[PDB]
Design a protein around this nucleic acid. Structure first.
Ligand SMILES: Nc1nc2c(ncn2[C@@H]2O[C@@H]3COP(=O)(O)O[C@H]3[C@H]2O)c(=O)[nH]1
Ligand SMILES: Nc1nc2c(ncn2[C@@H]2O[C@@H]3COP(=O)(O)O[C@H]3[C@H]2O)c(=O)[nH]1
Lengths: 227, 226
DNA sequence: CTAGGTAACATTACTCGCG
DNA sequence: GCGAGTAATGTTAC
DNA sequence: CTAGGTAACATTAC
DNA sequence: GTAATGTTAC
């Protein structure tokens, strides 16, 4: 593992070959059995993680028992850099829900590498901005929209992840998220998220078959807004 | 204006004197009458804004009519850098609700300056992280808490907007936010935000006088949990 | 006063191992 | 070439 | 079933 | 005469 394989991961995408070949022989392997906490929120964060295999959910848990799924990263994903760069503790909880393998990079090595190549800093920044945006958008979703609009916006964002700058009239998508997963991402209840999804398929928005959802972009924009 | 005066603003706080004096003769003045839109969300963002005076609210509007107050920046605040660094459009709407004056810095000048001094990049990054955190925390507040807990957490965070450090048992703070302001920050309704605040003062949490609120950190942590 | 949350229950689909 | 734990998906009455 | 939301009105504040 | 809280009902 050393060359154009690292470009797949965020931030590394904008790397030059000089900074990207070498600087990846400072990543140690690490794997986690299904359902294991990689770390907690309070943990000191002196390292960063790339994901090669498995599904790792990053989430926030309140003492009462309620959970908020931040994200469900998978292959080609990168997390664990905020607590790194920024000298504070971890801001979320990382838990592997299946057998997950990935590479690990230390704090000093990474910060010394940012000091080594200035433009890599840019990369980081551009990535951070992006993250912020995705988060803030989600904020809006949960602040100013009902459940149906919430799931509609979720599906639109998930399709815009795959096709990020075109976008058809009908598009299928292979989900890999349970309805409890959705309800926890959007801060709602599983039964009522199920209701909302069935309501959307019965309003002519999305047709849902074994593992697949054909989304009708038209009615989904009509549902994610009013008229 | 070319002094330790720039330190006050975020990001500039971690600046060295060499990068911070000079720097700042590439900032043009601009002022906005009360209630004027500085820009919108869709606008191309090729510049950044520092705030010297007035109160500028950054917020998100949905087409239906519902609003979410992001932030209520004021003197010594800095915004307008995300659309800059990151080549996308603006991510929020900036509107001055009073006569506001502040300095403006162009896109190319700022990015060329980050290319000039590498550590300034680090400054930006740490600032960004911070922002992210503040946002995400707010996310949690509105996802997993009722109204009373929401306002309790808001008051706790705001009293860290001052003593970031320490934190007593009873502390006063001079708000400068209406109850509609609060309800719009936390995505709620003004009447019910009023109810929640009165409920907190009647539960022994906060005593509220003309412009001031004495907060009882103890009962406020008890209210922001359970 | 409507949109939701929480506690129960009834199907329906996977998923192992043993084999 | 089976059953035993789950786990996901809907539904209901508060 | 219940916070939180809508409209409409009431008691204070150069 | 204002902007602002508090209230009520539903
Ligand atoms: N607040 C927040 N943290 C995230 C998000 N996605 C992943 N994380 C991770 O939560 C992790 C907490 O500590 P880190 O600084 O090491 O790295 C962080 C982030 O990379 C997100 O969308 N919001
Ligand atoms: N998404 C988001 N934007 C913010 C926030 N605070 C201020 N803004 C500003 O909204 C503005 C939109 O475009 P910019 O990139 O020019 O700069 C941005 C941010 O600085 C915040 O907390 N979240």
């Amino acid at each position: 593992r050393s060359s154009a394989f690292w470009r797949s991961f965020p931030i590394f995408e904008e790397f030059d070959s000089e900074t990207l070949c070498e600087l990846s022989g400072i990543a140690s392997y690490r794997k986690w059995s299904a359902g294991t906490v990689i770390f907690q929120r309070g943990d000191q964060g002196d390292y960063m993680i790339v994901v090669v295999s498995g599904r790792i959910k990053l989430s926030l848990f309140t003492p009462q028992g309620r959970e908020l799924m931040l994200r469900q990263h998978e292959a080609g994903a990168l997390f664990g850099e905020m607590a790194l760069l920024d000298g504070q503790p971890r801001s979320a909880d990382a838990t592997a829900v299946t057998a997950a393998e990935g590479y690990v990079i230390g704090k000093k090595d990474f910060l010394a590498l940012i000091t080594q190549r200035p433009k890599t800093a840019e990369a980081v920044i551009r990535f951070l901005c992006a993250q912020l945006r995705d988060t803030t958008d989600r904020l809006e979703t949960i602040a100013l929209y009902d459940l149906n609009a919430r799931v509609a916006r979720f599906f639109l964002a998930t399709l815009r992840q795959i096709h990020g700058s075109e976008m058809p009239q009908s598009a299928n998508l292979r989900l890999t998220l349970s309805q409890t997963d959705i309800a926890s991402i959007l801060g709602a209840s599983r039964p009522k998220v199920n209701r909302a999804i069935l309501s959307l398929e019965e309003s002519g928005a999305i047709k849902r078959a074994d593992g697949i959802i054909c989304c009708n972009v038209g009615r989904l924009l009509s549902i994610a807004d009013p008229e």
